[PDB]
């Protein structure tokens, strides 16, 4: 399995929210048929790359388990002994079985106490962490002794209670001690070497910080529609202060449950963006005039490439179909709603009439942005702490994103540059290229999962498509769309100038 579907879903949801907010601007800039075809193809390729990264992660994990020396199994046998004997104690009725068990796992634990855990092998024997581990095992042994002492008295019922107590104790200790997550840059390290890791961490962190900047500026570009009592720069100031004051990062994890609300609300927002013109009938005037033979045609290609980007940076077929049914209809409706009038309005609500449904979509996006920032402020801060080693260091980490967002109050252009430069590499070329490079050797080609479905009767096909995507994505995005996006960015910044005050006020 790998249990990466959850992270894939969460990051894809965030990326989908931002993209769905900004898409119609590129949709008109790209043309109906071109937009639809590019969207479908990029979504399928994104799903394929997600599958590739899942395969790589599993391969990496698998090799570890296997090439990893079997030494330190003894703990594992001890732990299995504890589990089985506790289960027997639960099944046990009379005093004889329970006491023999009690002796058995006590001996097992006494063996384990002298065995280094598989986590802190590089530490010194006298290191505090090892001392804490030994102290935990000592309290475990004390609980076992208490349970046995109860057993000798004939109070077999209380022996069960003591066993449950030790079960919950060892759970809350080890299940939170042994369980750990693996980050994809570690996976890259364990496969290719230091050089690729060295140049991959740079890309990952740069993409993370630019995504955070995009997420922040989304709030500025959005909340201004609640009320226009002051420039977007002042509401950006207040919001920047709000998010920075929450510099402290409580350790949060496993956001799968919290992402259901995000999914539902990001579905409702597109529902509004689409149905808000199907029966309203606001369509009139020129709506189809492109596509633009000019390079701008790529301006939207990069923006749509920004979509399906999160699924590969998470690790740091029907799911993409749901994203498709969420995105395509809203894009079509909005394009039909006003058409060519959007190119001067990067966002969507720009032409949305003041009705209660809009006042619900805006707050929905606001709280979604809150949730997304709360979930995505963990990894960049964690790596930055790992970069240099409570918050006497990370406190001003928000100043650079502050001073980067203020310079770029835009929503369409900056997104295009990010998509063309950072994600177009990190999510597309790095994974597939690394996967192809790993399996160059013939020996490595005999310990991997086969082609899942019955569609293709072949094995030298993963090369067929991975040899072509590597060049297609490069030449398409970075070949021309990146140049076009930077040209559009300079065109925008020259119009409103550096440190631009507002944007389409």
């Amino acid at each position: 399995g790998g249990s990466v579907w959850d992270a894939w879903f969460s990051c894809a949801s965030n990326q989908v929210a931002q993209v769905l907010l900004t898409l119609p601007y590129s949709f008109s800039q790209l043309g109906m048929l071109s937009g639809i075809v590019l969207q479908i193809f990029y979504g399928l390729l994104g799903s394929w790359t997600a599958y590739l990264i899942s395969v790589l992660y599993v391969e990496y994990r698998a090799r570890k388990e296997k090439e990893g020396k079997s030494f330190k199994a003894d703990l594992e046998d001890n732990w299995e002994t504890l589990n089985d004997n506790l289960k027997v104690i639960e099944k046990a009725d009379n005093a004889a079985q329970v006491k023999d068990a009690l002796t058995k796992m006590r001996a097992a634990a006494l063996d384990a106490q002298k065995a280094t855990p598989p986590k802190l092998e590089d530490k010194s024997p006298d290191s505090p962490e090892m001392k804490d581990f030994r102290h935990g095992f000592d309290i475990l042994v004390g609980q076992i002794d208490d349970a046995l002492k109860l057993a000798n008295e004939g109070k077999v019922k209380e022996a069960q209670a003591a066993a449950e107590q030790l079960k919950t104790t060892r759970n809350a200790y080890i299940q939170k001690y042994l369980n750990h997550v693996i980050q994809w840059f570690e996976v890259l390290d364990g496969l290719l070497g230091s050089y690729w890791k060295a140049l991959g961490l740079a890309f990952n962190c740069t993409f993370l910080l630019f995504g955070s900047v995009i997420q922040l500026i989304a709030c500025a570009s959005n909340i201004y529609y609640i009320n226009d009592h002051l420039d977007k720069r002042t509401w950006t100031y207040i919001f920047g202060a709000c998010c920075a004051t929450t510099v402290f990062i409580p350790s949060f994890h496993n956001y799968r449950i919290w992402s259901f609300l995000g999914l539902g609300m990001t579905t409702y927002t597109a529902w509004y963006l689409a149905i808000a013109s199907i029966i309203h009938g606001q369509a009139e005037g020129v709506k189809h005039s492109g596509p633009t033979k000019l390079v701008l045609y790529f301006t939207g290609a990069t923006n749509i490439l920004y979509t399906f980007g999160g699924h590969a940076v998470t690790v740091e077929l029907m799911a993409t179909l749901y994203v498709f049914t969420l995105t395509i209809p809203s894009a079509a409706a909005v394009y039909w709603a006003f058409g060519d009038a959007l190119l001067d309005h990067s966002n969507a609500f720009s032409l949305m009439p003041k009705n209660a449904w809009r006042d619900a979509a805006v707050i929905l996006m606001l709280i979604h942005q809150f949730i997304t920032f709360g979930f995505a402020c963990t990894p960049l801060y964690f790596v930055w702490e790992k970069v240099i080693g409570r918050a006497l260091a990370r406190l001003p980490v928000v100043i650079p994103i502050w001073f980067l967002a203020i310079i770029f109050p835009f929503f369409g252009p900056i997104n295009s540059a990010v998509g063309a430069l950072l994600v177009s590499f990190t999510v597309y070329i790095i994974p597939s290229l690394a996967h192809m490079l790993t399996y160059r050797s013939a020996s490595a080609r005999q310990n991997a999962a086969e082609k899942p479905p019955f569609f293709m009767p072949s094995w030298t096909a993963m090369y067929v498509l991975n040899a072509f995507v590597v060049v297609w994505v490069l030449i398409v995005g970075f070949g021309f769309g990146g140049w076009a996006s930077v040209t559009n960015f300079v065109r925008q910044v020259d119009t409103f100038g550096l440190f631009a005050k507002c944007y389409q006020c």
Partner: antibody
Amino acid sequence: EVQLVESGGGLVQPGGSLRLSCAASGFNVVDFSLHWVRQAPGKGLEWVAYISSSSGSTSYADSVKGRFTISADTSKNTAYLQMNSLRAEDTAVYYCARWGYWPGEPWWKAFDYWGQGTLVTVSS
Amino acid sequence: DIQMTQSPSSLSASVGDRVTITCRASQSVSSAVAWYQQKPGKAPKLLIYSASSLYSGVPSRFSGSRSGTDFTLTISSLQPEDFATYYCQQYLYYSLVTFGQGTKVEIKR
């Protein structure tokens, strides 16, 4: 230096009684687990009973269960021992032992400061 | 409850010759064994604890090893005053201690 001592050993007709006490000067026994390892003449050792005066967990051995009674005392820093219904097999020599409490080296070392021991018997 | 064995129930080695005594554990007890150098007529004295370490205050020539369920005692140089019964005993709980049969060393003639 710290030492133990055991007194009160003497012959008794089969079915009598006796009092064995392990006086422990110097080091204190108010938080230590005394034991009693018998030794039948010319045979190997065998554990008999133990007392954890701090909490109280006096458990005997199989061959002696239901016969010995091992009370506790703290003011005299002594742990008594009552014997009932002696048998011809009980004729042996008893030793008072010491055990550091779990966990740590104190506990990791077994009976170390063994006492001089006593000598009882059963005969007619 | 658990059983213990002592294969060399009787040995005899001359002075200046290394000897070794084995002691097998019925179960897989985690070290937690000791060896007592009981003189005839005196109180047994602890020599080795934890199956690997050495008790403080006795010659370093005594040293044992742990091997799965088999514990072995070793004496480098057999000085004349060490010819006395040696008992191997485990300890897994305050009421589960058992002692082996015991080995008697002797002078070769």
